[PDB]
Amino acid sequence: PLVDNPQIKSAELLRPLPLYQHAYVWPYVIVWPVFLRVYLTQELYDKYIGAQEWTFVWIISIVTFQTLTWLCTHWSVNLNALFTAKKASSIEDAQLIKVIPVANAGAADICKLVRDKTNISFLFQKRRFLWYPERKAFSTLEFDIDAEPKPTLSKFQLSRGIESEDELKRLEQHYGTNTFDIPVPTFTELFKEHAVAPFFVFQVFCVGLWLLDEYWYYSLFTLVMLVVFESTVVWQRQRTLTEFRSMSIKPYPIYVYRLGKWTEIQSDKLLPGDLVSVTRTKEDSGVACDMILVEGTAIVNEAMLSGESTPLLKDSIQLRPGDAVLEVDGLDKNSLLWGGTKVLQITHGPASGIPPPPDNGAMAVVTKTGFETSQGSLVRTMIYSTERVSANNTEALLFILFLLVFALAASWYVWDEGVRKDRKRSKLLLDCILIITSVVPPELPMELSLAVNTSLSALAKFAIFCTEPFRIPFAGRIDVACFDKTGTLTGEDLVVEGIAGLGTPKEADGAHTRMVSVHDAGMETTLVLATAHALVKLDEGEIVGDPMEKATLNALGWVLGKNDTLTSKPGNAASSGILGTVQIKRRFQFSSALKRQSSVATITATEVKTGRKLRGSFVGVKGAPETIMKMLVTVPEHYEETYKYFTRRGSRVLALAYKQLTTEGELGANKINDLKRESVEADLHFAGFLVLQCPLKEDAKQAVRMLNESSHRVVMITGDNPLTAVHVAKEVEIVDRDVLILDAPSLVWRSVDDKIRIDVDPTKPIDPEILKTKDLCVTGYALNKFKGQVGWKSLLRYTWVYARVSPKQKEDILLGLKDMGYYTLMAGDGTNDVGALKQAHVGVALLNGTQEDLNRIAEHPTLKLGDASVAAPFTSKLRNVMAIPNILRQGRCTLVATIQMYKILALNCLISAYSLSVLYLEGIKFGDGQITISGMLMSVCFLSISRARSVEGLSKERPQPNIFNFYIIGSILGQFAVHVATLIYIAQLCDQIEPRTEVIDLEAEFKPSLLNSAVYLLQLIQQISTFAVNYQGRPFRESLSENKGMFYGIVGVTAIAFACSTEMLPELNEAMKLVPFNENFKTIMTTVMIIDFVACYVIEWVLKKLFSDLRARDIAERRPDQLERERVRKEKEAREKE
Ligand code: ALF
C-alpha cells in the first residue's frame, strides 16, 4: 500500500485542477447559455414556460442543482477527489494526498505534502508521516530506540548531547517541537464548519419554502430557533475542546547540556538526543518528555499512566556493562521515566567526564518528544482518532424513510384530489411539496449526543470524569460486571494481626494456632521485617510507599534514617529486644510473575537478652508461601496445614524468610553488583508468617447488593490466593451456595473444608450436576490448561470467582466473555488491570483518593481533567465503590430519555402533516399568527419538559436499546391512528354543520371559517396531549405530578387551550382570528378532545406495561431462593424504617 499503518485503509496521490475545470463550473456554464437562448426565442416556447411562474421553477431547480453540486465537495471526501482532483502519474508531480482511515476509527481527510531539505512529509490527524524511497511508501517517524538493531548502552552512557548547531537545526526540522497541538477555534470557524451540514441546509431550504407562501412570522421564528440551536451546539463543542485542551503541561525552565555548556532552556524546546538535568518537579507539573536515566536515582509516582499512587524507585544505567551488552526493555524497565508522571524525590546515591549540573539533579537522555510518547499517543487517540456518539446513522435514516412513506401517500392523494377538480398546478405542487417537507424532523439523528452531554455533566457532578463519550450508551445494557479484590473492594489502612509459625497448641489437621505478638519475636524475624521493605522516606519528613509496609513499620516500632537506614539503638520500651542498625544496599522490585521481594543489606544487630551478635551481609525475602517452598532448604512438617487454617478465615498471610551470606564484614560491591536473581534466591531458611486482617470498604456490601438485585451479574477477578478470594466473595455476597475450588494438588476439584476431592480430565466435558448444584471458582493455572478443549465455553458461564490470574489472562477472560455477545464492565485501580480495562466495553479506574484533598483545593469540586488519568476511559477521584452503580444508572437514564424524544418527535411531525392535508383538500390555508402561536407554545412546552431529575436507586427493568421494536412502532401507530380518526370525524362533522360553497378562488386573505378553527384547536390539543402522555418517567425518573416545573407549564397551556375552546374569553378568540361557536358544537368538540386524550393514554399505558420490559439475559437469571431472600429483606427494611 501507499502508507504502512494498521489504521489507514487506502490512499492515493492527487493533483488540483484550475477553477474552470471544476465539476460545478464548466457543465453549468455550458447549460446556462442554452437555457437563456431557449428563453429568449419565441417559436421554441412550447416547453411549458408560457406561464411566468414556471421560469421561477426552472431557475430554482437549476440553482438547487448547482448548490448541491458545490456542497457535494464538502459533504464527502471521495466526491471531492472526483470533482476537484485529478490522479497523478508519479510522486514527483503529486500535490495532495487523500487518506481514508480504517472504518469507525476517525474521519477521512485530504492533506498537503511538504518537501524540505529531499524530505517528503505530510500531516494527518496531527501525526507526521514521512516518505521512504527504499520501501516506496509513507510511514510513521522513527527514533533511536525503535531501530531494528538494538543499540548498545554505550550510545547512551557516552552521549554528550548534540554538539553541532547544524545538527540541532536538522533535528528540529525532522521532528517537531515538544508540545501538544490542540488549538481551539473561534466561534466563526465552528459556525462555518457547521453551516454546510446537510440538515442545516435542509432547514434553510424548508424556511425558504415556507417564505415562498408569504408566511413571514413563522419563517422568522423558525430561523431564530435554528440559529440559537446551532449556537448552543457550537458553545458545547467549544467547552468540550477547552476541557480537553486543559490536559497539557505548562512550560517550566530546565537545564540542558548544549554545545558543551549548561543552559536554561524552556520545556517546549526539547529535542531527541538531548542531555537534560531532571530535578524535583513543582506543583501541578510533570516531566516534559520520555527520558532514560544515565546517572542518578529517582523516586517517582506514575499516577497518570497506571492509576496507583505508590511510589517507585527508578535506577540509573551507569552500572550496567554497556561496552558490548545490547539494550533490552524487559530488563531495563526500571530505568525509563515515562512522560506525564510526577517526580517525588531525586538522590545521587561520570564516564564521559561531563561536569555536573548546577542544580544537583539527576542526568537523563531524551528518547521521544511530542505526540509520539505513550501519553501523547493515548491523548491523540482520545481526541481525534476515536468513535463518535452515533457513528452509524442507520436506524434514524430508516425511521425518516418510514415517516416519508406516509408523507408520500398523503401528498399523492392530495395531488390526485386537486387535479380531479382542476386546481392551479403550481399552487397544488407547492402544497404537495410543503406537505412532503413538513414530516422530516431535522434533529432525529441527533438527540442522542445532547443526552450524552447532559449525563456527562451530571456524572461530573459526582466527581466522575469520562474521556470517551461514546461508551455512555454501552452502560445502558451492561450484563456482566467485573471487580478486583486488592485496592478496590478492600481498604487501604491495614492492621497487623501478628506473626506465627516461628517455632504449642495443635488442631486435628496439624495446624498451629499459636499467636505471637509483634513486640516479642525472633531475631531473624524482626531483622527481616526491618530490612525487607520497599518503603522510602522523603527529605521533607513524610513517609510514603506500600500501606502494608507502613503498617508493619508502625507495628515494628523502629525509626527510619536519612541515608535509607533503619535503627533502634536508642533505648525504647516499644521494641524491647533486638537493636542496632541495618543499611539496605540493593532492592528488587515486585512483579506480577515472581510474587516475591528480596533485599540485601549490611546488618549490625544485637540482642540484649541472650547476646547472639549478628554482623555482616544479609538477604531477606518475603512473599507468597508457595514460592518460599520452591526456595526452601528445609520444608516444615506443619507448613501447609497452618497456612491453610490461617488463610481460611480471610486473613492475608505473607511468608518471611532469611539468609546470611557472610558471617563477618561487608560482601563487597564487586560481587554485590555481580549477584543475580537466581543466585541470591537459593538455600534459604524460614523466618515466619506475617498474618494481617484486610478490612472491607464500608460501601462494598451496598453497591454489590444493588448491582446483584438489578438486571446484572457480578463476577470477581483477582490475583490473590483462592481461599482469601472465596472468603471475600462470601462476605460480599457474590456467592451464596457452597463453592468448590479447582486446582492442581492434576486438575482436581477440592472443597473449602477439604472434605471432598474429585478427579477430572481436561478433555472430557464437565459433569452437569457440578455446574448446576454448586458454584465454581477456577484458578489461573487450569484456565491456562483449558485453552482449547470443549469445556472452555461452559467454564466461562457458570463460575463467578477467579484467583491467581496473570494480567494477560484477565484480558483473555474479558475477551472470551465479550466473544459470546455479553456486554462487560470492569473496575480496577492497579497496574495489574491496565491491560484489561481497555479491552472491556466500559472501564473504571478507581483512583483511591481522599475527599479531604478534593475539598482542600482553592486555586488562587468539579475540578478539571488535569488531575485525572488516562489508564481507563472512566476515572473517579473518590474511594467509594458506590460510584460504580451511578454510571450504571446515568446511562440507564440517557437511553430512556432518547427513547421518549424519538416518540414525541415522530408523532408531532405526523400530526402536523395530516392537519395540513385536511386544510389542503378545501383550498384554505393556515394563518400566520395561529401557526406562530402554536410554534411558540410547542417550544415553551419542550423547554419545560426537557428538564428532569433522576431516581436515587436502580430498578429491575431495563430500557429498550434500539429504535425498531414492538413498543415504539406500536405506540406511534396507535396514537397516530387515534389522532387521524378524531381529525377525520371532526372534519366530517364540520362539513355537516356548514355546507361547502365549492367556489374555489385563491384570492383569499384568510377569511375566518369553522373548519380552520376546528382543525387548529384539535391539532393544538393533540400536540399538547402527545407532549404530556409520552413522558417516560415512571420507573427510572420521577413522575409528572412529583415535579412542578413541567407540571405548571403543562396545566397552564392546557388551561389556555381549554379557555380558547370554551369561549370563556371572547377577546382571546378574536386575537387569534377564530369564528364564534354555539353550544352543541362546543360540547361535541370538548367530548371529542377528551375521548382522544383518554384513548391515547390507555393505548400508551397498555403498550408500556406489555412490551417495555427488556428481559434479563440467561447469565443474570436468579434462582427463586435469592428472590425470596430479597423480598424478605426488603419487607424487613420496610418494617424497620420506624
Ligand atoms: F490488585 Al489486583 F487484581 F489483585 F488489581
Ligand SMILES: [Mg+2]
Ligand atoms: Mg488491584
